[PDB]
């Protein structure tokens, strides 16, 4: 496909997601591109906007492999096999250096606009593009343990690959899987830099 940049993306995004049912969602983007997808598409479909804040726990010298994640609010939620690939020191040393990593963000984020309520609500996880997927997995997996009453994952574009490691654990809408993904990037007219000064401004609009 080819969107003219990350609002008409989301403009789509949100049309595909109408049949769905969704009751008022919480449209939770990732950083830092993906909030502005989800901010067009909370603005669609009628639901609130957030951001999800969390970080991988790679495995040992195999960090694209993934034995967990962390939460802004600092849990460790592992995966139901991370100790036959790691001892719990390790787990609890990478679990404090992604910690560190998300600290500061999560902090200002959080200055100008609260941690929405998730538990027993619909929601919708939302980024401008998946290549591999790592981090909506590690977004999945902290938002599982929230008690959500629903969970989608919705994106503009992803690859063959991305998609079958997300569907596997949810319900999965993408507007398109091409067979030949070459980046996120290249399915956007204008791809340009999104600040995390451009976040917080997005995020201070939903704020009460």
């Given at each position: 496909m080819r969107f003219r940049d990350r609002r008409h993306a989301g403009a789509l995004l949100a049309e595909a997601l109408?049949?769905?049912?969704?009751?008022a969602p919480v449209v939770l983007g990732l950083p830092r591109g993906g909030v502005v997808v989800a901010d067009e598409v909370a603005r669609r479909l009628g639901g609130e906007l957030d951001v999800v804040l969390v970080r991988k726990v790679g495995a040992p010298?195999?960090?694209?492999?993934?034995?967990g994640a962390v939460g802004e609010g600092g849990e460790l939620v592992l995966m139901p096999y991370a100790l036959r690939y790691a001892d719990q020191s390790y787990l609890e040393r990478e679990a404090a250096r992604q910690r560190d990593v998300l600290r500061k963000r999560a902090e200002r984020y959080r200055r100008v606009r609260p941690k929405a309520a998730r538990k027993g609500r619909d929601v919708v996880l939302v980024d401008d593009?998946?290549?591999?997927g790592a981090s909506m997995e590690a977004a999945l997996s902290v938002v599982f343990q929230e008690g959500p009453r629903r969970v989608v994952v919705a994106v503009p574009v992803a690859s063959p690959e991305a998609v079958e490691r997300l569907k596997a654990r949810a319900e999965v809408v993408a507007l398109s899987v091409p067979?030949?993904?070459?980046?996120?990037?290249?399915?956007?007219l204008d791809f340009g830099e999104v600040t995390d000064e451009d976040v917080e401004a997005i995020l201070l609009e939903w704020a009460g």
């Open positions: 109408a049949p769905l049912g969704l009751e010298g195999n960090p694209e492999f993934a034995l593009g998946v290549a591999t067979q030949d993904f070459a980046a996120v990037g290249a399915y956007y």
